[PDB]
Design a protein around this ligand. Sequence first.
Ligand code: HEM
Ligand code: HEM
Ligand code: HEM
Ligand code: HEM
Length: 107
Amino acid sequence: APKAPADGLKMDKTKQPVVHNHSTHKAVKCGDCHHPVNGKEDYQKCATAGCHDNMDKKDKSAKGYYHAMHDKGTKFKSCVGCHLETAGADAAKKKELTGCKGSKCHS
Ligand code: HEM
Ligand code: HEM
Ligand code: HEM
Ligand code: HEM
């Protein structure tokens, strides 16, 4: 089985880079994020060519990188989508986990 990498991983395809820690996500199954493609969980970098390689932040296709990290209603929960559910009605956790600035994702 593939192993989780070290914490402190920077996602840096954009000018708004974000650090991802596997240890804080250890209760989420690996394949919720490294989701099936052609029937197999895919552990390539999310923006690999042919994957979420469209860097237009307005794109909502299966290639849109921004969309895959921020939007609701997606086949797999996105970073923000899952965090909204986690925060619930708690506005402090909404700021921390889903705020566009001043949050745990973006300063
Ligand atoms: C579950 C224990 C689990 C495994 C296994 C796993 C593996 C993994 C690898 C091998 C990488 C590095 C990919 C590379 O070649 O650089 C990696 C990276 C990311 N992961 Fe992961 N991962 C596991 C679990 C989870 C969970 C539960 C999430 C989602 C909450 C998740 C997400 C990510 C992200 C994002 C990356 C960075 C990929 C990128 O920037 O393209 N992982 N993981
Ligand atoms: C990297 C860890 C990674 C993330 C994050 C990610 C997210 C993601 C979401 C949120 C969706 C749903 C979008 C929607 O509008 O429903 C989604 C869908 C697909 N992805 Fe993805 N994805 C990550 C990694 C990868 C990799 C490495 C590839 C390419 C091999 C890839 C591809 C796709 C495709 C295709 C879809 C659509 C799948 C289908 O409808 O069953 N993703 N991804
Ligand atoms: C998507 C790639 C993604 C990112 C980025 C991300 C970030 C993140 C941060 C920065 C935290 C705070 C802790 C830390 O610094 O590591 C955090 C915390 C939680 N997350 Fe997350 N997260 C991403 C994805 C997802 C997804 C897809 C889920 C659920 C399916 C999820 C869940 C959680 C949970 C739960 C936490 C803990 C919340 C807290 O209050 O302590 N994340 N994430
Ligand atoms: C709040 C809804 C919110 C906004 C708005 C937002 C914006 C934003 C921008 C403009 C980028 C860069 C896009 C580009 O291509 O130029 C970006 C990138 C990432 N974000 Fe974000 N973001 C908002 C909220 C959050 C939160 C709360 C998280 C984490 C749960 C998060 C995550 C990400 C990730 C991952 C990226 C990509 C980082 C990279 O590869 O450089 N965003 N966001």
